[PDB]
Design an enzyme around this catalytic site. Structure first.
Site, PDB file in Angstrom:
ATOM      1  N   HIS A  68       5.639  83.253  27.273  1.00 40.20           N
ATOM      2  CA  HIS A  68       5.320  84.653  27.002  1.00 40.20           C
ATOM      3  C   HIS A  68       5.849  85.471  28.172  1.00 40.20           C
ATOM      4  CE1 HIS A  68       1.804  83.434  24.181  1.00 40.20           C
ATOM      5  NE2 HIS A  68       2.877  83.739  23.470  1.00 40.20           N
ATOM      6  N   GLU A  71       4.115  87.396  31.252  1.00 40.61           N
ATOM      7  CA  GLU A  71       3.182  86.686  32.128  1.00 40.61           C
ATOM      8  C   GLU A  71       3.864  86.308  33.435  1.00 40.61           C
ATOM      9  OE1 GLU A  71       1.044  85.053  28.101  1.00 40.61           O
ATOM     10  OE2 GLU A  71       1.673  83.573  29.577  1.00 40.61           O
ATOM     11  N   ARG A 126       6.239  90.283  24.951  1.00 42.60           N
ATOM     12  CA  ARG A 126       5.631  88.966  24.796  1.00 42.60           C
ATOM     13  C   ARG A 126       6.525  87.954  24.075  1.00 42.60           C
ATOM     14  NH1 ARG A 126       0.617  86.601  23.828  1.00 42.60           N
ATOM     15  NH2 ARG A 126       0.421  85.277  21.956  1.00 42.60           N
ATOM     16  N   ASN A 143       4.562  80.961  20.891  1.00 42.83           N
ATOM     17  CA  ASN A 143       3.372  80.116  20.864  1.00 42.83           C
ATOM     18  C   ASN A 143       2.625  80.136  19.521  1.00 42.83           C
ATOM     19  OD1 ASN A 143       1.879  78.182  22.252  1.00 42.83           O
ATOM     20  ND2 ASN A 143       0.323  79.678  22.885  1.00 42.83           N
ATOM     21  N   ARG A 144       3.304  80.568  18.464  1.00 40.85           N
ATOM     22  CA  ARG A 144       2.792  80.423  17.099  1.00 40.85           C
ATOM     23  C   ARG A 144       3.832  79.768  16.204  1.00 40.85           C
ATOM     24  NH1 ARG A 144      -0.589  81.993  19.924  1.00 40.85           N
ATOM     25  NH2 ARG A 144      -2.360  83.409  19.483  1.00 40.85           N
ATOM     26  N   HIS A 195       0.503  79.659  31.305  1.00 43.32           N
ATOM     27  CA  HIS A 195       0.375  81.021  30.819  1.00 43.32           C
ATOM     28  C   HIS A 195      -0.462  81.821  31.795  1.00 43.32           C
ATOM     29  CE1 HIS A 195       1.779  80.710  26.518  1.00 43.32           C
ATOM     30  NE2 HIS A 195       1.753  79.437  26.882  1.00 43.32           N
ATOM     31  N   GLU A 269      -4.258  78.970  31.793  1.00 43.25           N
ATOM     32  CA  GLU A 269      -4.172  80.421  31.855  1.00 43.25           C
ATOM     33  C   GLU A 269      -4.491  80.779  33.293  1.00 43.25           C
ATOM     34  OE1 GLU A 269      -3.126  81.616  27.864  1.00 43.25           O
ATOM     35  OE2 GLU A 269      -3.104  82.582  29.837  1.00 43.25           O
TER      36      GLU A 269
HETATM   37  C1  LIG Z   1      -3.063  92.125  24.811  1.00 47.51           C
HETATM   38  C2  LIG Z   1      -3.443  90.646  24.902  1.00 47.51           C
HETATM   39  O1  LIG Z   1      -4.193  90.283  25.769  1.00 47.51           O
HETATM   40  N1  LIG Z   1      -2.893  89.771  23.941  1.00 47.51           N
HETATM   41  C3  LIG Z   1      -3.113  88.324  23.891  1.00 47.51           C
HETATM   42  C4  LIG Z   1      -2.567  87.690  22.606  1.00 47.51           C
HETATM   43  C5  LIG Z   1      -3.094  88.071  21.267  1.00 47.51           C
HETATM   44  C6  LIG Z   1      -2.752  89.257  20.641  1.00 47.51           C
HETATM   45  C7  LIG Z   1      -3.268  89.602  19.397  1.00 47.51           C
HETATM   46  C8  LIG Z   1      -4.153  88.737  18.759  1.00 47.51           C
HETATM   47  O2  LIG Z   1      -4.650  89.100  17.523  1.00 47.51           O
HETATM   48  C9  LIG Z   1      -4.520  87.530  19.360  1.00 47.51           C
HETATM   49  C10 LIG Z   1      -3.990  87.207  20.609  1.00 47.51           C
HETATM   50  C11 LIG Z   1      -2.486  87.594  25.073  1.00 47.51           C
HETATM   51  O3  LIG Z   1      -1.467  87.995  25.558  1.00 47.51           O
HETATM   52  N2  LIG Z   1      -3.151  86.454  25.529  1.00 47.51           N
HETATM   53  C12 LIG Z   1      -2.606  85.658  26.627  1.00 47.51           C
HETATM   54  C13 LIG Z   1      -3.651  85.389  27.685  1.00 47.51           C
HETATM   55  P1  LIG Z   1      -1.956  84.160  25.867  1.00 47.51           P
HETATM   56  O4  LIG Z   1      -0.957  84.679  24.761  1.00 47.51           O
HETATM   57  O5  LIG Z   1      -1.220  83.387  26.876  1.00 47.51           O
HETATM   58  C14 LIG Z   1      -3.239  83.253  25.049  1.00 47.51           C
HETATM   59  C15 LIG Z   1      -2.750  82.175  24.106  1.00 47.51           C
HETATM   60  C16 LIG Z   1      -3.824  81.148  23.654  1.00 47.51           C
HETATM   61  C17 LIG Z   1      -3.989  79.851  24.453  1.00 47.51           C
HETATM   62  C18 LIG Z   1      -2.885  78.846  24.398  1.00 47.51           C
HETATM   63  C19 LIG Z   1      -1.965  78.709  25.441  1.00 47.51           C
HETATM   64  C20 LIG Z   1      -0.938  77.772  25.393  1.00 47.51           C
HETATM   65  C21 LIG Z   1      -0.804  76.921  24.298  1.00 47.51           C
HETATM   66  C22 LIG Z   1      -1.707  77.035  23.249  1.00 47.51           C
HETATM   67  C23 LIG Z   1      -2.730  77.982  23.292  1.00 47.51           C
HETATM   68  C24 LIG Z   1      -2.096  82.814  22.831  1.00 47.51           C
HETATM   69  O6  LIG Z   1      -2.716  83.675  22.200  1.00 47.51           O
HETATM   70  O7  LIG Z   1      -0.943  82.366  22.573  1.00 47.51           O
HETATM   71 ZN   LIG Z   2       0.728  83.356  27.036  1.00 46.23          ZN
END
Ligand SMILES: CC(=O)N[C@@H](Cc1ccc(O)cc1)C(=O)N[C@@H](C)P(=O)(O)C[C@@H](CCc1ccccc1)C(=O)O
Ligand SMILES: [Zn+2]
Ligand SMILES: CC(=O)N[C@@H](Cc1ccc(O)cc1)C(=O)N[C@@H](C)P(=O)(O)C[C@@H](CCc1ccccc1)C(=O)O
Ligand SMILES: [Zn+2]
Lengths: 307, 306
Positions: A68, A71, A126, A143-144, A195, A269
């Protein structure tokens, strides 16, 4: 320059990081090599550093940062990790033991197009930078996009969403490149995706509530790693499965790697818990990297000792 | 003066609050400033009232900046305030609107958050209330309303961007608006302005059931986005919150609609993600201008349909 005069306490551009990769390899060519595993949507090379003391496809640790792009502390920590490895091999007995048996692969900029975009245009970008047919919105959430519960609850089918999963699993070349590398290698023992932010250390699953069969071992290892992390500055991390510790996320990285038999599949994280969020001050880069390194050592040591 | 103010740049809280006072001083028979509360950190919360007379005339409520990082919304609000004073008595159509309706405009709906986006974290979203037992601060003001509060579409995790808080109206920034709206008793339209996504939406956010007024709100939405597009070709989509973006519980216009405010709408302004919340200052005035055309469309409908 040299990597000894590189400023690890500041944020860098893509070009600066890519130059660092070359300098690190030039300074350490019997320890470090640079592998190109693909090109991005916009044609930029995707580079992985391989740290190795010999052998042919030894058991290996995979560490990636910056999937992402916004980050920024993750790519900055990745650069620090790379230098730290070359400093400690042959000097620190514990780490030398790790690298004498295992290889380490480190992908510092896992999403180069997004990272470039955060410098040129939108600091909070992102996703990837792919175009999507039938939409004017750009990018897929890398990551999706993985083939583990792909397209199920925990992702969006709206191309304009931050969590758009893409048209099909591995549609994003940045993801497919890693998949292809991991499968061709065939002997990855630990896979750690880094992350920010939230201060969490998590294991699978994100896409479903059913615990992994290895939950007890992974939870004990998580406890050990966050203990190690906290020892330096007292930084407090929580831990657990992705779906319990943060939220449901489908098609995410470590659900896939675990499904391929990589038992020690973790995601960090990093700092902080929201005061700065993704905009962590540069003065926190090195402390973040240092404490994270202690946790990484814990996981790698565990991997080493449980062949 | 407000004539020498720079509308094409982003301003600080201090600068916007100074602007409020200037606009009132320059237009003393048209504009007044009402304090509806104090923030968690003690900052005053101000609403501008635009009125040509009467006793609690039917009114339009417009608020911007409830999510503090959405800077084009407060910047647009400043421009709207000036635009109202420029066009009243000059533009026949708008003059007719203000000769029957009052307009209430809350430019900085979350002053603590806004201050924080300037001092510390440009991407701050929530209020700045403290939460015991957490290392995290702030409640999502758009999940704190008493409409489907705490249901799916919000988080109970204090660290979450969408944390709903301990109970509905726990945030003084929200309760201040609730109190004002209920005391007023004659709000006919309520428009909450956010960014980004280029959307015009009506209730509900918290459930899929259509509102009884959906045909009217949908057709008015179409008219409004058509008006908006007429200026630069900017394309907005429209629909219920839950269909057009995602499920959101305890959100603002679900509550206002439930109180009988039929013309309850929310805008998501420019862009669709290229700059996201970091929209360049060069797009402030075009954003404000096109949105104004949509607002005029809603106000004229409100005017003509008691
Ligand atoms: C503004 C904000 O904080 N957005 C979130 C993401 C988001 C946006 C909209 C939604 O409806 C849901 C989630 C984020 O960046 N979160 C970051 C901290 P992340 O982006 O790195 C969290 C991560 C989940 C954990 C994870 C990490 C690695 C591998 C598998 C799971 C994710 O949501 O991808
Ligand atoms: Zn992330
Ligand atoms: C990364 C991201 O998508 N962030 C969201 C918020 C978010 C974060 C995590 C989640 O799990 C879910 C949502 C955002 O800032 N979105 C803004 C565009 P918004 O913040 O202004 C959207 C808004 C919904 C629509 C709405 C608007 C007004 C009144 C009622 C409903 C919201 O989510 O509050
Ligand atoms: Zn918003």
């Amino acid at each position: 320059r040299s990597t000894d005069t590189f400023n690890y306490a500041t944020y860098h551009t893509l070009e600066e990081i890519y130059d660092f990769l070359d300098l690190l390899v030039a300074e350490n060519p019997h320890l470090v090599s640079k592998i190109q595993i693909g090109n991005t949507y916009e044609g930029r090379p995707i580079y992985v550093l391989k740290f190795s003391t010999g052998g042919s496809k030894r058991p290996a640790i995979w560490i990636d940062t910056g999937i992402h792009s916004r980050e920024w502390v993750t790519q900055a920590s990745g650069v620090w990790f790379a230098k730290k490895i070359t400093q400690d091999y042959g000097q620190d007995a514990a780490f030398t033991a790790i690298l004498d048996t295992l290889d380490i692969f480190l992908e510092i900029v896992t999403n180069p197009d997004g990272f470039a975009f955060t410098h040129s245009t939108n600091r909070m970008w992102r996703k990837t930078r792919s175009h999507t047919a039938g939409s004017l919105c750009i990018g897929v959430d890398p990551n999706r996009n993985w083939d583990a519960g792909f397209g199920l609850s925990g992702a969006s089918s709206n191309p304009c969403s931050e969590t758009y999963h893409g048209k099909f699993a591995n549609s994003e070349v940045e993801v497919k490149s890693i998949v292809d590398f991991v499968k061709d290698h065939g002997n990855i023992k630990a896979f750690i995706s880094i992350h920010s932010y939230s201060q969490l250390l998590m294991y699978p699953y994100g896409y479903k509530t059913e615990p992994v069969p290895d939950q007890d071992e992974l939870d004990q290892l998580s406890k050990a790693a966050v203990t190690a992390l906290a020892s330096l500055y007292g930084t407090k991390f929580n831990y657990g499965s992705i779906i319990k510790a943060i939220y449901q996320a489908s098609g995410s990285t470590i659900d896939w790697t675990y499904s391929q038999g990589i038992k020690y599949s973790f995601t960090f994280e990093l700092r902080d818990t929201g005061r700065y969020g993704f905009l962590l001050p540069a003065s926190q880069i090195i402390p973040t990297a240092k404490e994270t390194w202690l946790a990484l050592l814990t996981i790698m040591e565990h991997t080493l000792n449980h062949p």
